[PDB]
């Protein structure tokens, strides 16, 4: 359910601090509005209002219309702006990171075994892996800057 | 760092759809509760003044 992992889910850039603060403030205020308000419809005390009204058939007609149906400021799920953006973000940020993590793990596993293995039989092969490991260090610095 | 960012990007992109869905669903519940409380307060004020 993560304040511990939700605030550190972004990258090294500080541009996501404004978007993460707006989503956390709207989510906390939405839960407090539903808990402070009553989860019932309406009381409509018509047992003591019909006999105490001055005009005849005044409180009885207003109680039948208020207990039926009325209008509210609601909307439907037709304007799914964030639903279409969530699927497109997974193909450019989540799916693209899978190929980068697979190439980084395969290059690091081959460089660890070549650095510990001799100097004529398994050397020329270790020199080729050392060139890819040296280029990986420059690519990692270019991806962070 | 690349493996940690790959798992975090999948959770951050999936949370964008759930964040707007929770706020849109809560807006309809808050508007329906405020409209029902306003009609109950208007009927109770007219009943208390008539009594």
Short mmCIF file of C-alpha atoms in Angstrom, two decimals:
data_model
loop_
_atom_site.label_atom_id
_atom_site.label_comp_id
_atom_site.label_asym_id
_atom_site.label_seq_id
_atom_site.Cartn_x
_atom_site.Cartn_y
_atom_site.Cartn_z
CA UNK A 1 0.00 0.00 0.00
CA UNK A 2 3.03 2.24 -0.51
CA UNK A 3 4.31 6.60 1.81
CA UNK A 4 7.56 4.64 2.05
CA UNK A 5 7.55 3.32 -1.53
CA UNK A 6 5.15 5.83 -3.12
CA UNK A 7 7.42 8.85 -2.57
CA UNK A 8 10.51 7.00 -3.85
CA UNK A 9 8.82 5.43 -6.90
CA UNK A 10 10.07 8.18 -9.23
CA UNK A 11 13.52 8.56 -10.78
CA UNK A 12 16.37 10.93 -10.03
CA UNK A 13 14.56 13.91 -11.58
CA UNK A 14 12.66 16.21 -9.23
CA UNK A 15 9.89 17.02 -11.71
CA UNK A 16 7.64 14.27 -10.29
CA UNK A 17 7.43 15.94 -6.87
CA UNK A 18 4.58 18.22 -7.97
CA UNK A 19 2.56 15.35 -9.45
CA UNK A 20 3.05 13.05 -6.46
CA UNK A 21 2.02 15.73 -3.95
CA UNK A 22 -1.23 16.51 -5.80
CA UNK A 23 -2.30 12.85 -5.96
CA UNK A 24 -1.58 12.23 -2.27
CA UNK A 25 -3.54 15.30 -1.14
CA UNK A 26 -6.60 14.42 -3.23
CA UNK A 27 -6.64 10.81 -2.02
CA UNK A 28 -6.52 11.80 1.66
CA UNK A 29 -9.29 14.40 1.32
CA UNK A 30 -11.59 12.00 -0.54
CA UNK A 31 -11.60 9.42 2.26
CA UNK A 32 -12.23 12.03 4.96
CA UNK A 33 -15.30 13.41 3.17
CA UNK A 34 -17.02 10.01 3.03
CA UNK A 35 -16.25 9.19 6.68
CA UNK A 36 -17.36 12.53 8.17
CA UNK A 37 -20.68 12.53 6.29
CA UNK A 38 -23.61 10.28 7.15
CA UNK A 39 -23.99 7.04 5.18
CA UNK A 40 -27.81 7.20 5.27
CA UNK A 41 -30.39 8.84 2.99
CA UNK A 42 -32.70 11.24 4.82
CA UNK A 43 -34.80 11.23 7.98
CA UNK A 44 -37.88 13.14 6.73
CA UNK A 45 -39.84 13.38 10.00
CA UNK A 46 -43.30 13.50 8.45
CA UNK A 47 -45.08 12.18 11.56
CA UNK A 48 -44.75 15.51 13.41
CA UNK A 49 -44.69 17.87 10.40
CA UNK A 50 -48.07 17.12 8.81
CA UNK A 51 -50.08 17.84 11.98
CA UNK A 52 -48.05 20.97 12.85
CA UNK A 53 -48.16 22.70 9.45
CA UNK A 54 -50.47 25.65 8.87
CA UNK A 55 -51.49 24.84 5.29
CA UNK A 56 -53.36 21.61 4.58
CA UNK A 57 -51.51 18.89 2.64
CA UNK A 58 -48.24 20.85 2.76
CA UNK A 59 -45.79 18.56 4.57
CA UNK A 60 -47.25 15.41 2.98
CA UNK A 61 -46.57 16.53 -0.61
CA UNK A 62 -42.99 17.61 0.09
CA UNK A 63 -42.13 14.33 1.85
CA UNK A 64 -43.23 12.16 -1.09
CA UNK A 65 -41.15 14.06 -3.66
CA UNK A 66 -37.98 14.17 -1.55
CA UNK A 67 -38.03 10.41 -0.90
CA UNK A 68 -38.29 9.51 -4.60
CA UNK A 69 -35.35 10.67 -6.73
CA UNK A 70 -33.42 13.85 -7.46
CA UNK A 71 -30.32 15.07 -9.34
CA UNK A 72 -26.69 14.88 -8.22
CA UNK A 73 -23.34 16.18 -9.47
CA UNK A 74 -22.01 12.84 -10.71
CA UNK A 75 -20.35 11.58 -13.88
CA UNK A 76 -19.80 8.33 -15.76
CA UNK A 77 -16.67 6.42 -16.82
CA UNK A 78 -16.78 7.68 -20.42
CA UNK A 79 -13.99 10.26 -19.91
CA UNK A 80 -11.31 7.70 -19.08
CA UNK A 81 -8.29 9.95 -19.52
CA UNK A 82 -6.06 8.18 -16.99
CA UNK A 83 -7.13 4.69 -18.11
CA UNK A 84 -5.75 5.18 -21.62
CA UNK A 85 -2.58 6.85 -20.29
CA UNK A 86 -1.83 4.02 -17.85
CA UNK A 87 -1.69 1.42 -20.63
CA UNK A 88 0.47 3.62 -22.85
CA UNK A 89 2.91 4.37 -20.01
CA UNK A 90 3.54 0.64 -19.47
CA UNK A 91 4.69 0.21 -23.09
CA UNK A 92 7.21 3.09 -22.98
CA UNK A 93 8.45 2.99 -19.36
CA UNK A 94 7.67 -0.49 -18.01
CA UNK A 95 8.06 -2.59 -21.17
CA UNK A 96 11.15 -0.64 -22.24
CA UNK A 97 12.78 -1.21 -18.84
CA UNK A 98 12.48 -4.99 -19.22
CA UNK A 99 14.90 -5.12 -22.16
CA UNK A 100 17.30 -2.75 -20.38
CA UNK A 101 17.29 -4.89 -17.23
CA UNK A 102 17.85 -8.07 -19.25
CA UNK A 103 20.83 -6.61 -21.12
CA UNK A 104 22.37 -5.19 -17.93
CA UNK A 105 22.03 -8.48 -16.04
CA UNK A 106 23.49 -10.55 -18.90
CA UNK A 107 26.48 -8.22 -19.33
CA UNK A 108 27.23 -8.11 -15.60
CA UNK A 109 27.09 -11.90 -15.26
CA UNK A 110 29.51 -12.39 -18.16
CA UNK A 111 31.94 -9.75 -16.87
CA UNK A 112 32.12 -11.31 -13.39
CA UNK A 113 33.05 -14.77 -14.70
CA UNK A 114 35.61 -13.42 -17.18
CA UNK A 115 37.42 -11.27 -14.61
CA UNK A 116 38.00 -14.27 -12.31
CA UNK A 117 39.16 -16.64 -15.08
CA UNK A 118 43.80 -18.07 -17.77
CA UNK A 119 46.14 -15.61 -19.50
CA UNK A 120 46.30 -17.36 -22.87
CA UNK A 121 43.43 -19.85 -23.14
CA UNK A 122 40.61 -17.93 -21.46
CA UNK A 123 42.17 -14.48 -21.76
CA UNK A 124 41.26 -13.34 -25.27
CA UNK A 125 37.66 -14.16 -24.38
CA UNK A 126 37.90 -12.12 -21.18
CA UNK A 127 39.26 -9.16 -23.14
CA UNK A 128 36.12 -9.07 -25.29
CA UNK A 129 33.90 -9.06 -22.21
CA UNK A 130 36.02 -6.31 -20.64
CA UNK A 131 35.31 -4.03 -23.60
CA UNK A 132 31.56 -4.45 -23.15
CA UNK A 133 31.86 -3.88 -19.40
CA UNK A 134 33.84 -0.67 -19.95
CA UNK A 135 31.20 0.61 -22.37
CA UNK A 136 28.45 -0.28 -19.90
CA UNK A 137 29.93 2.14 -17.35
CA UNK A 138 29.71 5.02 -19.83
CA UNK A 139 26.16 4.05 -20.80
CA UNK A 140 25.08 3.98 -17.16
CA UNK A 141 26.41 7.50 -16.59
CA UNK A 142 24.67 8.75 -19.73
CA UNK A 143 21.36 7.27 -18.59
CA UNK A 144 21.58 9.13 -15.28
CA UNK A 145 22.72 12.42 -16.81
CA UNK B 1 19.27 0.34 -9.92
CA UNK B 2 17.85 -0.67 -13.31
CA UNK B 3 16.13 -3.74 -11.85
CA UNK B 4 14.64 -1.67 -9.02
CA UNK B 5 13.42 0.98 -11.46
CA UNK B 6 11.83 -1.62 -13.75
CA UNK B 7 9.63 -2.99 -10.96
CA UNK B 8 8.84 0.51 -9.69
CA UNK B 9 7.80 1.84 -13.11
CA UNK B 10 5.23 -0.96 -13.44
CA UNK B 11 3.73 0.01 -10.07
CA UNK B 12 3.81 3.75 -10.79
CA UNK B 13 2.15 3.46 -14.20
CA UNK B 14 -0.55 1.12 -12.86
CA UNK B 15 -1.30 3.50 -9.97
CA UNK B 16 -2.21 6.33 -12.35
CA UNK B 17 -5.44 4.58 -13.37
CA UNK B 18 -6.39 3.70 -9.78
CA UNK B 19 -5.73 7.23 -8.48
CA UNK B 20 -8.17 8.89 -10.87
CA UNK B 21 -10.73 6.09 -10.48
CA UNK B 22 -10.78 6.50 -6.69
CA UNK B 23 -11.24 10.28 -6.89
CA UNK B 24 -13.97 10.05 -9.54
CA UNK B 25 -15.88 7.44 -7.54
CA UNK B 26 -15.55 9.49 -4.34
CA UNK B 27 -16.84 12.63 -6.08
CA UNK B 28 -20.15 10.94 -6.90
CA UNK B 29 -20.51 9.59 -3.36
CA UNK B 30 -19.74 12.98 -1.81
CA UNK B 31 -22.16 14.81 -4.12
CA UNK B 32 -24.96 12.32 -3.45
CA UNK B 33 -24.39 12.55 0.31
CA UNK B 34 -24.32 16.36 0.26
CA UNK B 35 -27.51 16.54 -1.81
CA UNK B 36 -29.32 14.14 0.53
CA UNK B 37 -28.15 16.07 3.60
CA UNK B 38 -29.29 19.36 2.07
CA UNK B 39 -32.81 18.07 1.37
CA UNK B 40 -33.01 16.63 4.89
CA UNK B 41 -31.85 19.90 6.44
CA UNK B 42 -34.31 21.95 4.38
CA UNK B 43 -37.21 19.69 5.37
CA UNK B 44 -36.20 19.70 9.05
CA UNK B 45 -35.92 23.50 9.09
CA UNK B 46 -39.43 23.90 7.65
CA UNK B 47 -40.81 21.31 10.08
CA UNK B 48 -39.18 22.96 13.10
CA UNK B 49 -40.45 26.41 12.12
CA UNK B 50 -43.99 25.12 11.52
CA UNK B 51 -44.02 23.27 14.85
#
